[PDB]
Amino acid sequence: ASMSDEQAEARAFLSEEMIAEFKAAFDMFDADGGGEISAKAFGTVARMNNVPVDPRVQEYVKRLTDQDGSGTISFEEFLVLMVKSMKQDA
């Protein structure tokens, strides 16, 4: 369970057209149909989408699976993460 307040800014920055692309990319990894992908998958998705993976976010990303054991991010989080990474990337 994530925080959808983060989703608000994500939808403000990312256009529906962008959200749609990230949704499709996310779905590619969510073959389970749970709306949640592996934490480390974020880096892979970002890379193929030409999105620079921020080192700080990646630190936080690896910590997700590090502290929880099996880190999984929901589509909502994924969108916000893409935002954080692109925002931090100068």
Side-chain angles (χ1 to χ4, degrees), residues 51-73:
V51 177
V53 183
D54 171 68
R56 294 176 59 252
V57 182
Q58 182 55 267
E59 176 65 52
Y60 151 82
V61 168
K62 72 177 183 184
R63 291 300 164 184
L64 294 170
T65 195
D66 180 59
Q67 62 182 29
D68 191 81
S70 304
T72 43
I73 37 174

Side-chain angles (χ1 to χ4, degrees), residues 36-54:
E36 290 174 63
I37 64 174
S38 311
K40 281 297 183 180
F42 163 75
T44 311
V45 186
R47 290 172 59 190
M48 73 176 183
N49 289 332
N50 295 327
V51 177
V53 183
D54 171 68

Side-chain angles (χ1 to χ4, degrees), residues 21-43:
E21 299 188 79
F22 295 129
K23 175 60 179 61
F26 182 92
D27 186 78
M28 292 285 299
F29 286 73
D30 179 44
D32 182 86
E36 290 174 63
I37 64 174
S38 311
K40 281 297 183 180
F42 163 75

